[PDB]
Design a protein around this ligand. Sequence first.
Ligand SMILES: CCS(=O)(=O)N1CCC(NC(=O)c2[nH]ncc2NC(=O)c2c(F)ccc(C3CCOCC3)c2F)CC1
Length: 288
Amino acid sequence: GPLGSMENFQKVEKIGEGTYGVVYKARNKLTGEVVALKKIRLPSTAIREISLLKELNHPNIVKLLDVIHTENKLYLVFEFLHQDLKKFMDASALTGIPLPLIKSYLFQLLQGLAFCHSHRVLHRDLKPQNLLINTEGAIKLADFGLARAFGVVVTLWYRAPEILLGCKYYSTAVDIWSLGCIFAEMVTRRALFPGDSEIDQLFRIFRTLGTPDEVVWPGVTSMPDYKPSFPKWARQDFSKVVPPLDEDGRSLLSQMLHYDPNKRISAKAALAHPFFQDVTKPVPHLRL
Ligand SMILES: CCS(=O)(=O)N1CCC(NC(=O)c2[nH]ncc2NC(=O)c2c(F)ccc(C3CCOCC3)c2F)CC1
């Protein structure tokens, strides 16, 4: 659209770029605020979707402050946070993130998800780099994926099996799956399912959880991309998958990784799991 609408913002650094667009750190020249700017290069559905997201205000969701259309670009102004979970896990890789902080982050993300999901809002794209942390121990959901993307990276590792099997109308359960994969990664300091193609992702899931069938996932053999020629792997023990997670955490993770989206635990039920009886909010050691 029109010109000059972004002149109030001074870009201070390009944080990254990719399939999502470009992310900048910026300063409002008139108010002095430090914000993140997302730039999308150039849709009625997306306007409605983005408008609803601006109304979703929750401690564990990165606040979307403004939406500005200028030239061939759409800019989204977000509250700034200084670090993502990927960098924090890398920085913690020698010692591990202490379990109380893992549990705090997992709890808070389930709160954010239960809130989104109660509004029928899906994130769709959860991974460590979509999770931002601050010095006060908060963690926040960032860069929600829309039902219809728009605009002119091995983002497979956290994708739910129903997406890989061609489900067109998937559910909030896909976010619970992704968060389970992130939970396991925080505990073990390795990606749970580090696939490098859609089929390698699916087959890594199958080799660990067992090839799904109609007993554990009714309807699976009818899904658009299921092939009867899928190899039949046996399931392994969770004691092998995420050691040394205690049995409360293994139990919760098992429910987050159910094949059947009808059986996979909801964010709301997950908040009640006994793993969270002793949840606290620790302060992370954050180097900025
Ligand atoms: C070594 C890097 S860092 O750990 O030091 N760090 C320093 C700077 C930090 N802050 C922010 O980006 C930030 N603050 N408020 C909002 C916000 N971003 C976003 O809201 C955001 C976006 F609009 C589009 C795409 C992505 C991800 C980009 C990566 O791919 C997955 C999607 C986003 F996050 C994050 C990382």
